UniProtKB/TrEMBL annotation, chain A:
The keyword Lipid metabolism does not apply. It comes from Solidesulfovibrio fructosivorans JJ]. Its cofactor is Ni(2+); Fe cation. Belongs to the [NiFe]/[NiFeSe] hydrogenase large subunit family. Its EC number is 1.12.2.1. Ca(2+) binds at E48, L490, H544. The modification Cysteine persulfide is found at C538. This is Periplasmic [NiFe] hydrogenase large subunit. GO terms for cellular component: periplasmic space. The lineage of its organism: Bacteria, Pseudomonadati, Thermodesulfobacteriota, Desulfovibrionia, Desulfovibrionales.
UniProtKB/TrEMBL annotation, chain B:
GO terms for biological process: anaerobic respiration. The lineage of its organism: Bacteria, Pseudomonadati, Thermodesulfobacteriota, Desulfovibrionia, Desulfovibrionales. GO terms for molecular function: 3 iron, 4 sulfur cluster binding; 4 iron, 4 sulfur cluster binding; cytochrome-c3 hydrogenase activity; electron transfer activity; ferredoxin hydrogenase activity; metal ion binding. It catalyses: 2 Fe(III)-[cytochrome c3] + H2 = 2 Fe(II)-[cytochrome c3] + 2 H(+). Residues 177-259 form the Cytochrome-c3 hydrogenase C-terminal domain. It comes from Solidesulfovibrio fructosivorans JJ]. [3Fe-4S] cluster binds at C225, C243, L244, C246. The keyword Iron-sulfur applies. It is found in: Periplasm. Its main location: periplasm. This is cytochrome-c3 hydrogenase.
Amino acid sequence: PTPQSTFTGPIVVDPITRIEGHLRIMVEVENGKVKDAWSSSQLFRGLEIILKGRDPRDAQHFTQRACGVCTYVHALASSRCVDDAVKVSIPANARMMRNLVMASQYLHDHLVHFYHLHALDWVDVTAALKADPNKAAKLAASIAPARPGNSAKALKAVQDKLKAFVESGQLGIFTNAYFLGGHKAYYLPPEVDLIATAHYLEALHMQVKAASAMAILGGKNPHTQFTVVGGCSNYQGLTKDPLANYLALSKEVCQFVNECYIPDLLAVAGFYKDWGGIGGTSNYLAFGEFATDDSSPEKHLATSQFPSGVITGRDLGKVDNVDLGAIYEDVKYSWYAPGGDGKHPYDGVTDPKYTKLDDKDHYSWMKAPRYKGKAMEVGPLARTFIAYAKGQPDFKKVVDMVLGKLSVPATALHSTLGRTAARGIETAIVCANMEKWIKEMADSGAKDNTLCAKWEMPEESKGVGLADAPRGALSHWIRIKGKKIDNFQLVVPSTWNLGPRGAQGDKSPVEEALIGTPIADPKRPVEILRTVHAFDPCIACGVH
Amino acid sequence: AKHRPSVVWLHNAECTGCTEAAIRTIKPYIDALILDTISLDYQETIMAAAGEAAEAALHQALEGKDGYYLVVEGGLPTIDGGQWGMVAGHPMIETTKKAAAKAKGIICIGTCSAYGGVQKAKPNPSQAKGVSEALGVKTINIPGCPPNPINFVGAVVHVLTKGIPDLDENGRPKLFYGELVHDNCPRLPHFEASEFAPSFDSEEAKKGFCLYELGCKGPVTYNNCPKVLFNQVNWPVQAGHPCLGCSEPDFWDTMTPFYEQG
Ligand code: SF4
Ligand code: SF4
Ligand code: FCO
Ligand code: F3S
Ligand SMILES: [Mg+2]
Ligand code: NI
């Protein structure tokens, strides 16, 4: 059974490490299970305030700095947002280039998240020192495709490297790790810890290649610089040699995804099947991504190859269309002036007002985005359920492969385990589509290299840019007046997932996912981290 | 086993783009750097410990007998006694101040920690400041948004092995920030010939003309971008887009509008 203490009392985890940004989590525990929770964002920067009165063309450069982990996505959302406000339809090549760069971002983002942010919640690195490299090799051979990196020689070299490190006494980033000295919530045998650690180290090199691929089209990573109002500026990104190099790098990354990421994910999920019954929520929203027609937000929602939709009460039989008019943000439990509740983003207000730490009536710098009164989970799991429910062929195949491997029903995906698996699932699907997407653009760019359209700044207008970033549904909302920014509002995936309670006192997805979390050791609450990390929190994003 | 120099890395008002930049290093790769060269003793983005355990890891590193070097990412929000930016229930300004007091050296990675950065742009609602601006201490600045990992790792390695490198007036190492972007730009001949793109959709843009008229800040920006590239493959002007001047102090207010000339 799942290890669980008898602990009753409060637990605060601040800082939450291995996320982007500054998060404080508070929980109340009763007999070893979480009974109440608060998600408290600890930094405010105020990009929305800073943008007022500025040139709309400048928006993307400021908003990109909402986040350096999900780099690019905010530049994209801002460009879509402004493109919509000035009523310009970008050329086919720009749509293709923009979507490829997003694809590249998914690959980089998910890989790094699983290995460098999430894995340490399930993998005991020091236990890898106890493994026999030969037995670990033999294991890796049965649970994953053959590769020289999984040989006894390669695994022993990793182990020796790790041993020299631990024996030095300078544990660095492993100092005071929750797994040191063993921990009941860590289930993996030493051989699997060794395999996961070896891949952890390989992933550090692989992420460099994933970023290079992205930079071929995006100019640089982090913080791309190739998008303009009306399309893209990167004519070179349409030519033969850079696209050949992009494809080569992408295939290297996709090989790592299929040889290491997916097998590690499945191996881990196999040991932690109990986590298929922990951390579930009920509502899912996605704006979709990889549209074949990005001429407008309505077209984006309708033509996204990763479909948009809204699921409520876990009902996979009723995927509704996204109503952009039904989105609003509450501030009742947030550090903003009371009275800003129920604002649709076109009328958004950002008036910071701090109180104090652990004030249960105002406890976060994130607003609380709600959809028709309901908290919505966004991200890989949302996209996966939505696509699965709509019978999207790739998702249907890859989900059923996972459910079969684990021998669990689809309802098991409503959990922290499912949330982690979904992230791998869509990485595999992005990978499966790269060659086709690249070829489409290579051929298109060879024939006609139009990349940017002509446009004009209106005196007064509004627009919305939608994207499904790696963490979920992202939207930028602009009001233009006197040819300047009059209002600019970001509603970001982490705002949906990790924001505080709404005006009704209703918990956010992460707050609700935490209820029922078993705590094996109140001194070292890894289980809180498992669920929180599964949402892939980005607090710079959520707060902006 | 040789003792590795202790590095404490703090995150303040930042987007984590600088941390991400740092891990794109290939000379050496990040694993080789933290296993062989330094002891990265606190780094919130990647460290295993969380909460009180992470806070004790920091206190341990600050009390280490051999001392430590301090890397600071992000600006410092100063409004409301620093309470709009908190870690472990302490204001970021307070923790950065303590950590700085005893550091062997201080490296500011990124325009935000060096000069205030994006949260400092008008009207600066959190009253954000650069590290040097808020604490009154000399820092080695590695600016850019984010800086090239070549510049950061180069500086870190230089500081541990050779001492403080020669710095310009903005506290930037001349090794990396000694030359204007523009002076090494492959489009310089177009600039010298008055061959400018009037728009991004123009035939001039397609032919790779100079981007000066589209707002390129290369002529007033100190950085090594065209010389070393990013991710071993590209830089913004090669990607057809003007330089924003992202390594210059307060560029958010001095280089905007981005698509216009000063
Ligand atoms: S300097 Fe730029 S990339 Fe670095 S933390 Fe600041 S905004 Fe992010
Ligand atoms: S593109 Fe920019 S840096 Fe290059 S020559 Fe022209 S103005 Fe100078
Ligand atoms: N992915 C991502 Fe960042 C968040 N949350 C955005 O958008
Ligand atoms: S925008 Fe920054 S990245 Fe180099 S090219 Fe200009 S200094
Ligand atoms: Mg917002
Ligand atoms: Ni982000």
